[PDB]
Design a protein around this nucleic acid. Structure first.
Lengths: 185, 170, 124, 130, 61, 106
RNA sequence: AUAUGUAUAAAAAUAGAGGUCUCUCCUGUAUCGUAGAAGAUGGGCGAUGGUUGAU
RNA sequence: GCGAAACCACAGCCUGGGGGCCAGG
RNA sequence: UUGAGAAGCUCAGACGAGUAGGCAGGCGUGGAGGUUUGUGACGAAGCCUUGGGCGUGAGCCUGGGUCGAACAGCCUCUAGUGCAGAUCUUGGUGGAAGUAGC
RNA sequence: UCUAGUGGGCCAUUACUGGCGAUGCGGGCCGAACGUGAGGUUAAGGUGCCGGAAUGUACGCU
RNA sequence: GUACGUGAAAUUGCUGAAAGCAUUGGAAAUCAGUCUUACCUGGGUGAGAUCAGUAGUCUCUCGAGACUAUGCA
């Protein structure tokens, strides 16, 4: 099932797997937005990606986690062609969750999840912490904003669940739900 | 002008005999089929008889407003809905000539074709309406007795998100 | 039979686009290092006999007839027995006096004329 | 023939000069400058350029602005001729607009140029009666 | 404007339009995708004029 | 909800091609919900179309349709090969096609 | 100063979470909306409903 | 104001690998 | 059954890179003889053309515009007969450049 | 019987043998000898993305 | 219109539109051609000719063409 706009929570996803999934979607005409890019995970110890980046530091050197992921997708696209540049403009990778996107459903990619792809006990790095060490200086405020949004969203879920309780109780109250329940619904 | 004037390459005798068309198994008369193409796409229609190539089908005109029409067996979805009693209505009158279109004619003279105000309308004649009403009379008790038929046929078939036709069983 | 054409594009000469001094008529590339003569990828094609069209529908215009150039009225009367096989074409140097006489004769003969509306007007 | 007909004959005037002993490139830049102006404004502009007030910009042959005296002298007389041709043709002098001024090269004899100017009246739209 | 159809002739349209209350029939003659002539007949038997149009420009042009 | 739809959404993926040579005469189409070559056998022979806009009022409409047909499966992941009456433009990669349900056999 | 119903918002973990000592997860094949001359014209029964456009 | 001439396959961002080729910046 | 341009028509099967080099058939130009009861001031030739057509091609036919006096097909004859280049010859015209410069 | 053209060199395995040279095409030496096409199927090499094709299945090391 | 028959290309200006070698198609602009009026059958009305249980002339070789009368079964 495909639609025009998807929001992907990047927490617990591997950088390469998620970018490759994202890149294939973009070339298919699907507008993709990736949020919480600083919770992205990378296989290997912290120093390994750290020496990878400082080698890259030794071209514009960008430190933000959202633009770290954007570079990963960019190498997986035909950027030299008008088709690739069109696809890239369809991708909006952001850190944290902007308010326009926190009120919408967020899907996850099972083929890219770290839990389903990394053996337990394997060391893994986080893009947010790696970026914060190479020059990024906004993880304090991003983390603080995350708590406020998480608190507000948690209250919304409680309100949604409380409203759900009434209809859930009224479901079995009506005898129609049990009159012809043989249909499987 | 009768002795040929040209080489007249006569076609070699083709050995393509005409055999009766084997329709689908699920297109039995009386079944409810979803119309897929035409002006009445998405309508659910009861099959009356199996013509040589098409199916003579009609929706009960008081239900969905689908008159007596032919439809190709490739443009109908045969559903597993319970069949409607159609043995009570004569169908032998519905032949190829019955559904044919008015042969081109319009006897005209060379003063009214110019200043073209003579074209009549092709309004369906009375006996077509009478046959449709007679069919409705012979079909309505069959669909009324079994529940949900009247509302099912007055409905329309339409897909939505999450509906996968390759897995849905009609 | 239907008039099948294996190819519809002209076989432009190599580098005819680069230079105005180089015409677009086909010349075989006589060069010994010519990449295009070597039939690399993307190199423009060269006239081969395989593009030759069906002997049954060679010389046939899209309407299945063959052009038969005609200079006067006596020519269109030759096509009396071949009007399903040939189409008359009035030469460019035939005047408008004769063109009318050619077209009127050919009309009774049941012959298609490819350029019957040329050099003339209608009065009705 | 004149290269362009941007108006109707009753509402235009033309003047031309052939094999004028000047420079083709300087004339082209002056012609580009005064194209599209009005006859009153162009006359002011050419006098200003003459008396070191405004400079003719160079766009294609920049190699910027300059004050080509020989070129503007030719264009001043040609426009005076076109204005006079509008008098004899019974044209108004307030809507006169330089519609098509063109400079073409001449047989090398140097770089002489052919200059043609067509001045028309400002086209107007009458109100629709509705 | 009645589109000319069939085997009707200018001497037959004139009679037909005469009995239908028309008083002047204009026939725009074209061939080869250009309107080159215009014949008008004054109904029912009035003088008929034959013109050859030229420089035919439409409002877009 | 609104309904009135009798088609399955599909995407124009790319042309049939090798690594460096492309074939515009056959196109690769991904259908919604079809994820294996066993399920792709259902949609073979169906009529797929590309619908787009224009500027000229051809018979009083701004709509234009290029029809087609599904020919065979492609690969293992439910992609199919679609032949269109006119080869689809290369600019319509990732565009949205419409897989009608006719001709039907189920 | 001047686009084919475009539907679905908790957090964190996979060597545990949520809800009230007890229960659930093991994907959304789910949930909300889905009949109408592309959505016509009327009548009855039961609740104060549902969907909305404009203030 | 006057006014050339030589010259000109074609043109002009870097790195690596085999001034346009390949992969990147 | 009409399908002998017997140099015609018809059946079948195999095959298809190509430098040097060999063989064959064709396209084009100037002039010659014959021929087309050939074309032409109701427009020859030439030229222009995002008009159309034919041939694998060399090329040919044609519509429209321009033009104003001659031209062509077919069968043979003949040759000062086919160009992208020779730091080719002659003429014309560019970028350099309104630069260097006076 | 005649009658044209050539009697170079390079690469690789074991003086020999092939290959290059007069030879384009798929892959990046391997594969494959070429008329114009339609369809089917493959060789070599491949199926995360760029890139057509399993983010296949199973057994193991890092 | 003497810088004069025709007036090619290179080349230059202006205006208009678009954009910043091949394959395949889209968009825009343009273009080619495209048919209905005929076939058969029946009748009515007249027409004639190659028809006349019909008369003449000329040219060819009995009858073959071309005619001029007269009739219309």
């Amino acid at each position: 099932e495909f639609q025009k706009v998807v929001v992907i929570d990047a927490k617990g996803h591997l950088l390469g797997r998620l970018a490759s999934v994202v890149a294939k979607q973009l070339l298919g005409g699907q507008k993709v937005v990736v949020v919480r890019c600083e919770e992205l995970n990378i296989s290997g110890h912290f120093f390994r990606n750290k020496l990878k980046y400082l080698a890259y530091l030794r071209a514009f050197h960008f430190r933000a986690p959202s633009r770290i992921f954007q570079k990963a997708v960019r190498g997986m696209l035909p950027h030299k062609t008008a088709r690739g540049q069109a696809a890239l403009e369809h991708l909006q990778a952001v850190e944290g969750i902007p308010p326009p996107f926190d009120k919408q459903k967020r899907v996850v990619v099972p083929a890219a999840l770290r839990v389903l792809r990394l053996k337990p006990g394997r060391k893994y790095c986080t893009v947010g912490r790696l970026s914060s060490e190479v020059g990024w200086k906004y993880n304090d405020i991003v983390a603080k904003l995350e708590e406020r949004r998480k608190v507000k969203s948690a209250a919304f879920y409680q309100a949604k669940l409380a409203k759900q309780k009434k209809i859930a109780s009224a479901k079995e109250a009506s005898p129609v739900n049990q009159k012809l329940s043989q249909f499987g619904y | 002008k009768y002795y040929p004037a040209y080489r007249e390459n006569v076609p070699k005798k083709a050995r393509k005999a005409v055999r009766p068309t084997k329709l689908r198994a699920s297109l039995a008369p009386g079944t409810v089929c979803i119309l897929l193409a035409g002006r009445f796409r998405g309508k659910r229609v009861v099959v009356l008889s199996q013509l040589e190539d098409t199916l003579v089908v009609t929706g009960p005109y008081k239900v969905n407003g689908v008159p007596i029409r032919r439809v190709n067996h490739r443009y109908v979805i045969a559903t597993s809905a319970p069949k409607i009693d159609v043995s009570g209505v004569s169908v032998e009158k519905f032949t190829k000539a019955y559904f044919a279109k008015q042969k081109r004619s319009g006897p005209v003279k060379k003063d009214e074709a110019f200043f073209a105000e003579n074209a009549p309308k092709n309004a369906l004649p009375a006996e077509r309406i009478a046959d449709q009403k007679a069919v409705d009379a012979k079909l309505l008790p069959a669909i009324k007795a079994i529940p949900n038929m009247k509302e099912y046929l007055a409905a329309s078939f339409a897909l939505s998100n999450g509906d996968r036709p390759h897995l849905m069983k009609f | 039979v239907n008039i099948i054409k294996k190819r519809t594009k002209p076989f432009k000469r190599h580098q005819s686009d680069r230079f105005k001094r180089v015409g677009e008529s086909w010349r075989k590339p006589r060069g010994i290092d010519s990449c295009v003569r070597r039939r690399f990828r993307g190199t423009i094609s060269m006239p081969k006999i395989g593009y030759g069209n069906n002997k049954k529908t060679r010389y046939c215009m899209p309407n299945g007839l063959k052009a038969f150039l005609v200079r006067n009225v006596s020519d269109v009367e030759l096509l009396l027995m071949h009007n399903k096989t040939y189409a008359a074409e009035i030469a460019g140097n035939v005047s408008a006096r004769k063109r009318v006489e050619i077209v009127e004769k050919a009309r009774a003969l049941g012959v298609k004329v490819t350029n019957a509306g040329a050099k003339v007007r209608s009065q009705e | 023939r004149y290269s362009a007909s941007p108006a109707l004959e009753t509402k235009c005037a033309k003047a031309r000069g052939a094999y004028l002993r000047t420079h083709f490139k300087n004339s082209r830049e002056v012609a580009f400058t005064i194209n599209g102006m009005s006859l009153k404004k162009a006359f002011i502009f050419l006098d200003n350029v003459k008396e070191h007030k405004q400079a003719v910009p160079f766009r294609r042959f920049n190699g910027q602005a300059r004050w080509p005296v020989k070129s503007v002298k030719f264009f001043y007389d040609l426009l005076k001729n076109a204005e006079a041709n509008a008098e004899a043709k019974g044209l108004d002098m307030d809507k006169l607009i330089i519609k098509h001024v063109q400079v073409n090269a001449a047989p090398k004899q140097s770089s002489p140029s052919h200059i043609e100017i067509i001045v028309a009246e400002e086209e107007e739209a009458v109100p629709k009666a509705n | 404007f009645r589109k000319r159809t069939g085997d009707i002739e200018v001497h037959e349209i004139a009679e037909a339009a005469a009995k239908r209350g028309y008083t002047d029939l204009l026939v725009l003659n074209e061939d080869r995708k250009k309107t080159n002539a215009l014949t008008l007949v004054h109904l029912p038997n009035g003088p008929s004029f034959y013109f050859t149009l030229s420089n035919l420009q439409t409002a877009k042009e | 909800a609104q309904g009135h739809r009798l088609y399955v959404k599909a995407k124009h993926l790319s042309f049939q091609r090798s690594k460096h040579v492309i074939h515009p005469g056959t196109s690769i189409v991904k259908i919604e919900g079809c994820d294996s070559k066993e399920e792709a056998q259902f949609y073979l022979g169906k009529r797929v179309c590309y619908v787009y806009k224009s500027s000229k009022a051809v018979r009083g409409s701004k709509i234009r349709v290029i029809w087609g047909t599904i020919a065979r499966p492609h690969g293992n992941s439910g992609a199919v090969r679609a032949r269109f009456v006119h080869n689809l433009p290369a600019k319509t990669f990732g565009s949205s096609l419409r897989v009608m349900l006719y001709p039907s056999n189920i």
